[PDB]
């Protein structure tokens, strides 16, 4: 249910 | 940080900076026997 | 949070949400204390019973939130953990006294109107507000029932503290000096309670005197989620307030 967060904070 | 927590901690941009209170916040003041 | 209502924008700048990379969910709730600190209850991070112990890179730290799911696009901020520090002493074995960890952030990050710390009570805050029946507000994005749903928007609740013996006689775990109760009792006619999803949370206090918010307490543990003549247990801020102090001077800040 979460939506995605910018990649760079992965 | 720390002690009391910060400098300018504890007081709220959109809230205590500018004079305005949030819609429940009096619920606790008067429950310290009403605030200040 | 059950029986709260949603937060106005900016109400709890120092709500901290601790964030699991992948699978992506929220794991509790945390508070910003400083630009680079953030203090969250221990069990969030381990709790060998359940096999759950998180490490810095398990995770990650997003401020500034309103919305529970979405990506608030310029508004949070998401960052990653330097150092995750347990208190030497957290007793998960019997009855997770000593619930705090503290998690030192990558780098610091900037305050704006939706991200700014809270301050830790001195000896005297602590002395004039934690007393039966003075209420203190708990947020969060934890569950909304026992068992249900969940909700949008960040939380919150107002509850009084609760006077020792009631907390004690409510249970049969063993309370401690580093936890005190809140919430209403059956009589009282008014509900509310942390839920899942709330664990690590602030329960913070506003001075009288200053007009500040304090940080007294973190969401610890409790017996189901607003059950009637039971409440909530909370890690006492300013009883672990020294560790604290060493944590940040011998380390960072
Ligand atoms: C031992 N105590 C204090 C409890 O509250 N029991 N629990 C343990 C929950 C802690 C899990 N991370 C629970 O009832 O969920
Ligand atoms: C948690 O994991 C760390 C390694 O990342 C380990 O040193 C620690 O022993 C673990 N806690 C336990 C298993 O109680």
């Known amino acids: ?10 | 940080t720390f002690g009391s927590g910060e400098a300018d901690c504890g007081l709220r941009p959109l809230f205590e900076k500018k004079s305005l209170e949030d819609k429940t916040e009096r619920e606790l003041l008067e429950s310290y026997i009403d605030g200040r | 949070i059950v029986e709260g209502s949603d937060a106005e924008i900016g109400m709890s700048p120092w709500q901290v949400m601790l964030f699991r990379k992948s699978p992506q969910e929220l794991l509790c709730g945390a508070s910003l204390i400083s630009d680079r600190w953030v203090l969250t209850a221990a069990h969030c991070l381990l709790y060998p019973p359940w096999d759950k112990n998180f490490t810095e890179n398990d995770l990650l730290v997003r401020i500034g939130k309103h919305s529970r799911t979405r990506y608030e696009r310029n508004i949070e901020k998401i960052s990653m953990l330097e150092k995750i520090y347990i208190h030497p002493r957290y007793n998960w074995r019997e009855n997770l006294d000593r619930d705090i960890a503290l998690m030192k952030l990558k780098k610091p990050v900037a305050f704006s109107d939706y991200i700014h710390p809270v301050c830790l009570p001195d000896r005297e805050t602590a002395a004039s507000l934690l007393q039966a029946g003075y209420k203190g507000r708990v947020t969060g994005w934890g569950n909304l029932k026992e068992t249900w749903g969940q909700p949008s928007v960040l939380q919150v609740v107002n509850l009084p503290i609760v006077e020792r013996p009631v907390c004690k006689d409510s249970t049969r775990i063993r309370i401690t000096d580093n936890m005190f109760c809140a919430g209403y009792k059956p009589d009282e006619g008014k509900r509310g309670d942390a839920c899942e999803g709330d664990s690590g949370g602030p329960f913070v206090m506003k001075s009288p005197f200053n007009n500040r918010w304090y940080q007294m307490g973190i969401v610890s543990w409790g017996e189901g989620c607003d059950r009637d003549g039971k409440y909530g247990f909370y890690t006492h801020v300013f009883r672990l307030k020294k560790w604290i102090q060493k944590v940040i001077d011998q380390f960072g800040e």
Do not use: K, V
């Open chain 1, 1 to 10: 249910d979460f939506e995605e967060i910018p990649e760079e904070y992965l």
